[PDB]
């Protein structure tokens, strides 16, 4: 199956990009809720395209694509530092999810990108430290720790890496969609399917969370849950 070739490629940094475009604030949508736990639109989308799409340093066009500087003189772990385009040879072949979020020493991205697979540099393997389906958040290096948390009340921007192009910082204010439970409040955006792992970053580089699990709705708009850093619940002693 998979979990045998999942390569990283830095494209940008996890930060507000000056390409700030107001496109969110999308009012009331109707999304088809699957048994309350899941939520989606009943329209089969298909849009596996981000990494490559031009001779942009990172690439190969054979296996995967990279931008990883782990050096033989003093290195051990992997750290390209920032917002990554990411692509595996697995599941349905050679396809890119896009956004891999590594800040300081912690790599923290979405769960729905996988079912808890291992990472690498096209034939050099590195294991993640955490995977959680509930919040839809995975970690590498250790337990995730930032600070900020976005929720439907304040306005933010989503840092979505474009296919073959620059990190599209889209200004996304709170949105919501109608539900069997009444309404869910989330990030409602009229735009192309934003990259999986897109960090929720303010103009001042605040919050720096993650776009949650969602779908291309109206076969045109992209609406997804809000994911944020609650700080990793280390109830257990880290050593003793």
């Amino acid at each position: 199956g998979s979990a045998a070739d999942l390569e990283l490629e830095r494209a940008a940094d996890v930060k507000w990009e000056d390409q700030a475009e107001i496109s969110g604030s999308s009012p009331i949508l109707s999304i088809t809720i699957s048994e309350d736990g899941s939520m989606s639109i009943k329209n089969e989308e298909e849009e596996q395209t981000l990494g490559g799409g031009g001779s942009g340093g990172g690439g190969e066009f054979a296996g995967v694509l990279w931008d990883v500087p782990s050096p033989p003189p003093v290195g051990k772990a992997e750290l390209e530092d920032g917002a990554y385009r990411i692509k595996q040879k697995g599941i349905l072949g050679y396809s890119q999810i896009g956004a891999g979020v590594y800040k300081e020493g912690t790599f923290h991205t979405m769960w729905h990108v996988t079912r808890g697979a291992v990472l690498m540099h096209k034939g050099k393997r590195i294991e993640p430290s955490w995977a959680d389906v509930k919040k839809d958040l995975i970690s590498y290096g250790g337990g995730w720790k930032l600070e900020g948390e976005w929720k439907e009340g304040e306005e933010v921007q989503v840092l979505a890496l474009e296919p073959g192009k620059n990190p599209r910082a889209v200004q996304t204010k709170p949105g919501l969609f109608k539900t069997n439970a009444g309404t869910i409040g989330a990030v409602s955006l009229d735009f192309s399917p934003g990259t999986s792992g897109s960090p929720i970053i303010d103009k001042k580089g605040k919050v720096v969370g993650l776009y949650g699990n969602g779908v291309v709705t109206r076969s045109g708009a992209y609406v997804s849950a809000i994911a944020q850093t609650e700080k990793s619940i280390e109830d257990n002693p880290e050593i003793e």
Binding site: Q48, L50, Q96, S196
Partner: peptide, 4 residues
């Protein structure tokens, strides 16, 4: 790393 696959779809989105």
């Amino acid at each position: 790393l696959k779809r989105x």
